[PDB]
Design a protein around this ligand. Structure first.
Ligand code: SF4
Ligand SMILES: [Zn+2]
Ligand SMILES: [Zn+2]
Ligand SMILES: [Zn+2]
Ligand SMILES: [Zn+2]
Lengths: 754, 167, 351
């Protein structure tokens, strides 16, 4: 199609359209006209990605100003989803237009999933791979190699071929999805990571995960060339706040503290030996401190920066010397005092939580070490290590942990809160004190971007209610609109199976435990569904331990034998690799004959990015409703902050979060409108939350479908599956809900110009 | 045409799948003599699991695997495979049983090793998780039974691969 | 309020010769309780009905029956042109009870083997009455599907109360892509009409393929009675036919000569074909108030026309569903009868 938005050619890649998509285009354009934020809940039953990209590409390529687009999907999985879809859009746009492209748009993830060097990438832990690539191609090992040709220094050489040809120019012209990028850069033997990383200065539109936007420890290279004005799109933004918090929290365990002790000892050895060999350079660095923050080589570092800056991006940093810390031995002694104070405060008997200011004063009491010198510890340690040009980091992992802790707790205040839990009550009365440190205000991490960028978007197939986010994140919006699934047919059957056959209220709320009534009830539910649905089914237990116990003692009964007799079982397990393997076998079985069941965790990785299309998902479940307070009081503290700072009570917030995750789980089971699928729930408490759900889910959830028993549930879903199976394709009722090629939109809404 | 028909009616390998599995699950009752599909079930076992075939073969010259062999097999295998780790209780998994247990451990290990594809980067949960960043989370969501889950995964994938084999 | 086919848009080609290999489903699934006796008994009954019908309307084709028990495909009737053999085979089966899982792959491979001898002008086909929700394959399936479509073997399947992805792929694959052949049912009557529509030859839009003249000859009945003697079953039969060329007796059939192997027919089979090739234009339902035509039937003489102004009754409709080319009326019963049983339109014959 090529219709108009009263100024904008739109090269929508499909002959068909959807109505909701057209409204989406209209409203997002209206947003881009006037600087605002205007969160927009478009049900995932449609294609939100196609609408977003089509309109935004057309806008950027039509007006002359907003030259760059930033797209932040939650996980690299959705990164490549957006990438492949964008590539197809681009091909369509060229095909309809000839060649008017001149367009580049690149994904951006990390070394671990990009480093092509065989031996390097053979490593598993991402941090190690990062370190290996750093050493193999640093500003220093290159000098060691070139000045001293020797077997000591090797290189990916992909960095070298880049240095030869790629950093004069760019990749040919494509919007390279990771499949395409990896294939090509394998052929031409390049290092994809550095390729895209340097390329950022030229890509018309960039796609990268949230962390690269909010995690200050990697959101450093944000080069306002990237936007300065750009139009920014948050896809799948319902889990924003937790990304901020997890980007700003921090953990401590006495064992890591002892590791830091070992690292400090190794540091003493290293400084001793080097100052025996060379100290004049160390004094030169003393002078480079005394002149200023040493930005000339604490910041002008093509390859150097060792310890990231966990504080917000340099906003809350001074630039003078850290006074006495200028001496390296002084610094080591400072860290010694710090770690010992941490140990003794760690031996505290029971739970204790403090404001950072309070803890700061207490440390001052025990050892008068001031805040201002403390803040500089991170870069101090990092550049000291650079001056030490150490051969390994594993010894210093705990050191950088402590540096991060010091910087955070010395920098921010009155938004964060310490807490010292001496143990894990799930195995209480054991030695395992943890110095948990976390933020409370989600808005802190976001605030810089809403400060920087002007026109931003928020979009998800699940966001609800559309007012909690302006509250929590403390940001101004314009258009807070929700879109309704205009369907000429039912197409999915939300239910609330509150009572099993025993007509007994059920949930996971009681405990994390057994109560054979509940267990047998759920097992009956699951097995009858496994009998009835065709290939493809999911479940979403509320928490991992819950699944572990439940399935263990299901296997105790014979319940699993029956579902074995019908379909396949594919559990969800903590190691990511095996999880991916299981998931792909699930897909392979669904599209094959045998039906297959995958049971996972709502909070877990599976729900985050994985998609469940027509075949791959028919009948999700929600065994229980996901809640967190199973574990300790960090949620309690954050909720305290919530109540005092925002006019929000506990159960309100808890229910809101729970329904957020529930909707995120549920929305996965549809892709288009041709798709369909049951979406059951299961708990007594669900019945009253019917309004918390996103609108388009609520519409399909009629009143009569509440607190149904399992039996009537099976009846209804049987009738559904049969009815949907029918080829109910009048194709004239689809002129209502499809707005066919170039005309029904044109006719209908060009008349609706009223 | 009669010949062709006959030949096709002959060389008709049954599927693996259910009966193959079942030979460990759906087969827990007839503690009598040669049960249902006795030769058929045992050959399904053999194609399904090399270890039992090898043990039975090794225990032909002595120790009859008909009654006493299958009796001890109940304990040993049907605890090893299928249900939870018997660990305690009837530890009849002895001699050939225990030996083959030890074997099958690392054997299934090496099989699983032989299973790892470089999955296409849509699904790549591995590269998906954590292998973008170097981050610091929390984690809070008790041994054993994880092996049970790996067992069912391994069984299913072995089945499917014995079918992608295009034998 | 009407439920009519708008237009027929392949009234130019069909597969007149056929070799359809119906494959039933006799596996543990078919023992559930959704259709009155079960799935299985009702299935076999309707299968008998369909066998009679199909060998009527396509009286020159063959057919073979295949079951799927215990994951095996066991041929229960060689591909043959005599309805009675297949009928008896089904009779025998219906007293036997299903077991094991349906091995769609094995049945498919057995068919593909079975239809090899069928010559080029004859057309192949299969009709899976798939009842279960799974298969159990001893091999790659897409391998088989590819082999199938390589051997030009259309397939139509009639699932029971669900939709299975692989079957949908199967139908979409062999039938030149054009997906319409995976129709699944929602009621017993729907099932009857399913088989009924399976009876007819099958066009979609045929690719330009080889069209070939086929040698065949017609027999002449015999006279003597005591001289009972047969050359196709080696019995004494009181009188039969003579191959015009082989010149040997053959018990009554449209069968192939068992001596010189050329097809035998009378003509009435060819007449059935003619009926299928060029059907009529669907009879139109005349306008309620704009007809002003004769108040009777035409082929019959029915008194069911109207009522002349009766609030809602006359406002309903005017039973005058009238064919186009002859432009003469016909009551509903007459139109149903013409378009079902006899296809010579009464008036359109006369001019
Ligand atoms: S970017 Fe190049 S040098 Fe670095 S890890 Fe990847 S392949 Fe190795
Ligand atoms: Zn005869
Ligand atoms: Zn003859
Ligand atoms: Zn009449
Ligand atoms: Zn006529």
């Amino acid at each position: 199609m090529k219709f108009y938005i009263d100024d904008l050619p739109v090269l929508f890649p499909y002959p068909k359209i959807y109505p909701e998509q057209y409204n989406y285009m209209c409203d997002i354009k209206k947003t881009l006209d006037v600087g605002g934020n205007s969160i927009l809940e478009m049900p995932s039953g449609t294609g939100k990605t196609v609408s977003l990209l089509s309109l935004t590409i057309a806008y950027q390529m039509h007006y002359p100003e907003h030259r760059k687009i930033i797209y932040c999907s939650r996980t690299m999985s959705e990164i490549e989803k957006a990438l492949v879809e964008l590539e197809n859009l681009m091909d369509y746009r060229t095909k309809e237009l000839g060649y008017q492209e001149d367009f580049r748009g690149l994904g951006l993830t990390s070394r671990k999933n990009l480093c092509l060097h065989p031996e390097v990438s053979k490593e598993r832990k991402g941090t190690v791979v990062d370190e290996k690539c750093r050493r193999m191609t640093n500003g220093q090992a290159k000098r060691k190699l070139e000045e001293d040709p020797e077997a000591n220094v090797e290189l990916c050489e992909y960095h070298e071929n880049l240095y030869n040809i790629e950093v004069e120019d760019y990749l040919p012209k494509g919007v390279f999805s990771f499949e395409k990028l990896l294939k090509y850069c394998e052929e031409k033997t390049l290092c994809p990571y550095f390729i895209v990383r340097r390329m950022i200065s030229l890509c018309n539109i960039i796609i990268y995960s949230y962390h690269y936007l909010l995690d200050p420890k990697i959101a450093e290279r944000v080069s306002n060339e990237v936007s300065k004005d750009s139009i920014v799109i948050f896809d799948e933004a319902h889990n924003i706040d937790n990304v901020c918090i997890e980007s700003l929290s921090l953990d401590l365990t006495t064992d890591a503290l002892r590791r830091a002790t070992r690292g400090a000892n190794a540091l003493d050895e290293r400084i001793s030996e080097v100052r025996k060999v060379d100290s004049q350079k160390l004094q030169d660095e003393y002078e480079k401190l005394v002149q200023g923050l040493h930005s000339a080589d604490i910041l002008t570092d093509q390859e150097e920066p060792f310890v990231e800056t966990p504080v917000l991006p340099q906003d809350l940093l001074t630039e003078a010397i850290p006074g006495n810390i200028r001496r390296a031995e002084h610094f080591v002694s400072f860290l010694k005092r710090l770690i010992e104070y941490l140990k003794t405060r760690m031996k505290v008997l029971h739970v204790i939580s403090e404001t950072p200011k309070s803890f700061l004063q207490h440390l001052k009491q025990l050892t008068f070490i001031e805040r201002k010198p403390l803040r500089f510890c991170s870069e101090r340690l990092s550049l000291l290590v650079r001056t030490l040009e150490v051969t390994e980091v594993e010894d210093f992992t705990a050191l950088k942990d402590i540096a991060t802790f010091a910087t955070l707790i010395s920098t921010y205040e009155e938004g964060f809160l310490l807490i010292i839990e001496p143990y894990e009550i799930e195995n209480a009365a054991v030695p395992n004190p943890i110095m948990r440190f976390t933020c409370l205000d989600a808005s802190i991490a976001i605030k810089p971007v809403f400060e920087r960028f002007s026109s931003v978007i928020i979009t998800s197939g699940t966001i609800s209610p559309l007012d909690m986010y302006p509250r929590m994140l403390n940001f101004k919006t314009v258009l807070q609109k929700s879109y309704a699934m205009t369907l000429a047919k039912k197409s999915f059957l939300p239910m609330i199976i509150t009572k099993g056959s025993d007509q007994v209220a059920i949930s996971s709320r009681f405990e994390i435990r057994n109560d054979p009534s509940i267990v047998r009830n759920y097992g009956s539910m699951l097995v009858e569904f496994a009998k009835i649905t065709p290939d493809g089914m999911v479940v979403f237990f509320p928490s991992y331990l819950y699944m572990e116990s439940i399935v263990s003692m299901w296997q105790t009964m014979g319940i699993l034998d029956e579902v074995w007799k019908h379909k396949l079982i594919l559990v969800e397990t903590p190691d990511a690799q095996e999880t991916s393997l299981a998931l792909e076998t699930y897909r392979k079985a669904c599209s094959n004959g045998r039906g297959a069941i995958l049971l996972s965790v709502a909070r877990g990785k599976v729900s985050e990015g994985i998609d469940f299309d027509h075949q791959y998902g028919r009948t999700v479940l929600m065994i229980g409703i996901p809640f967190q307070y199973t574990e300790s009081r960090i949620l309690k503290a954050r909720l305290e902050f919530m109540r005092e700072n925002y006019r929000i009570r506990e159960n309100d917030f808890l229910s809101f979060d729970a329904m957020r995750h529930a909707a995120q789980c549920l929305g996965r089971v549809l892709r288009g409108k041709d798709d369909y699928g049951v979406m059951v729930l299961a708990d007594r408490r669900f019945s009253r939350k019917r309004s918390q759900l996103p609108k388009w889910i609520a519409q399909g959830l009629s009143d009569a479908d509440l607190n149904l028993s399992t039996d009537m549930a099976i009846s209804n879903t049987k009738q559904f599956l049969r009815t949907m199976a029918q080829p109910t394709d009048p194709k004239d009722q689809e002129g209502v809900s499809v707005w066919s090629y170039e005309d029904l939109i044109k006719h209908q809404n060009s008349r609706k110009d009223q | 045409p009669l010949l062709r028909a006959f030949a096709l009616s002959t060389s008709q390998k049954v599927g693996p799948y259910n009966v193959l599995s079942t030979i460990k699950p759906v087969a827990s009752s007839e503690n009598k003599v040669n049960v249902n599909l006795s030769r058929e079930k045992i050959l399904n076992i053999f194609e399904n699991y090399p270890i039992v075939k090898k043990a039975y073969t090794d225990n032909v010259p002595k120790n009859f695997k008909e009654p006493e062999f299958w009796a001890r097999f109940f304990s040993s295998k049907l605890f090893r495979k299928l249900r939870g780790e018997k660990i305690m209780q009837n530890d009849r998994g002895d001699v050939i049983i225990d030996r083959y247990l030890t074997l099958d451990q690392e054997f299934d290990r090496k099989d699983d090793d032989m299973l790892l594809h470089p999955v296409k980067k849509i699904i790549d949960l591995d590269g998906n998780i954590q292998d973008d960043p170097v981050v610091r989370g929390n984690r809070p969501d008790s041994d054993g039974t994880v092996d049970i889950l790996k067992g069912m995964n391994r069984l299913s994938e072995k089945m499917i691969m014995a079918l992608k084999n295009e034998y | 309020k009407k439920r009519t086919a708008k237009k027929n848009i392949t009234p130019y080609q069909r597969g007149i010769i056929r070799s359809l290999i119906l494959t039933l489903d006799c596996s543990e699934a078919m023992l559930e309780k959704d259709l009155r006796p079960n799935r299985h008994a009702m299935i076999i009954q309707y299968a008998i009905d369909f066998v009679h019908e199909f060998f009527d309307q396509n009286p020159i084709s063959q057919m073979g029956i295949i079951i799927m028990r215990n994951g095996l495909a066991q041929l229960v009737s060689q591909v043959s042109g005599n309805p009675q053999d297949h009928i008896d085979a089904l009779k025998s089966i219906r007293k036997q009870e299903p077991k094991g899982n349906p091995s769609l792959q094995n049945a498919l491979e057995m068919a593909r083997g079975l239809l090899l001898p069928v010559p080029a002008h004859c057309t192949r086909e299969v009709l899976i009455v798939f009842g279960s929700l799974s298969t159990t394959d001893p091999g790659d399936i897409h391998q088989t599907i590819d082999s199938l479509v390589s051997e030009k073997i259309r397939v139509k399947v009639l699932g029971l109360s669900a939709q299975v992805a692989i079957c949908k792929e199967l139908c979409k694959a062999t039938n030149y892509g054009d997906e319409s052949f995976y129709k699944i049912l929602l009621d017993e009557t729907h099932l009857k009409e399913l088989f009924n529509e399976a009876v007819t030859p099958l066009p979609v839009n045929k690719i330009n393929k080889g069209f070939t003249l086929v040698k065949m000859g017609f027999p002449t009945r015999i006279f003597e009675d005591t001289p009972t003697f047969c050359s196709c079953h080696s019995k004494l039969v009181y009188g039969g036919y003579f191959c015009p060329n082989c010149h040997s007796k053959v018990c009554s059939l449209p069968t192939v000569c068992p001596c010189c192997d050329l097809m035998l027919i009378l003509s009435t089979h060819l007449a059935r074909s003619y009926h299928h090739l060029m059907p009529l234009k669907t009879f139109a339902e005349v306008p309620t108030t704009e007809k002003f035509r004769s108040e009777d039937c035409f082929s019959c003489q029915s008194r069911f026309p109207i009522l002349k102004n009766h609030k809602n009754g006359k406002l309903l409709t005017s039973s005058r569903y009238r064919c186009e080319d002859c432009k003469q009326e016909f009551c509903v019963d007459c139109d149903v009868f013409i378009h079902e049983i006899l296809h010579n339109c009464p008036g359109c014959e006369s001019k």
